[PDB]
């Protein structure tokens, strides 16, 4: 019940670097696999419309928190990003240069 998602460093609630609250801390999501299915789940869960793009490679900067998720492979209609298939939690397989991001339609 404590899980939560936000976008940061994008200048709007509805675009930016994806962060998930896990074990007390906001962590980032590695783009080792990242796509618009994943972005659409994020955009929907936040009430931000639909994804227009899903930029990886720390486009919205590198987080400082733990990298909590990687290999996230949503189908696209999941209600929460954590409900999508993913490679457990806290894999330590990535660096922050791979932090994933989203741009949603509701961004202004
Ligand atoms: Cl929000
Ligand atoms: Cl947790």
Swiss-Prot record:
Q: Which cysteines are joined by disulfide bonds?
A: 30-94, 43-104, 74-84
Domain of life of the native organism: Eukaryota
Instruction: Explain the post-translational modification.
Output: Highly N- and O-glycosylated. The O-glycans are heavily sulfated.
In the induction comment, the record states: Up-regulated in intestinal epithelial cells in response to pro-inflammatory stimuli including TNF and bacterial lipopolysaccharides (LPS).
What is written about domains in the entry's comments?
The SRCR domains mediate binding to bacteria. The minimal bacterial-binding site is an 11-residue repeat of GRVEVLYRGSW where VEVL and W are critical residues.
- Involvement in disorder: Glioma: Gliomas are benign or malignant central nervous system neoplasms derived from glial cells. They comprise astrocytomas and glioblastoma multiforme that are derived from astrocytes, oligodendrogliomas derived from oligodendrocytes and ependymomas derived from ependymocytes.
Self-association and partners: Interacts with LGALS3. Binds SFTPD and SPAR in a calcium-dependent manner. (Microbial infection) Interacts with HIV-1 glycoprotein 120.
Similarity comment text for this entry: Belongs to the DMBT1 family.
* Protein name per the record: Scavenger receptor cysteine-rich domain-containing protein DMBT1
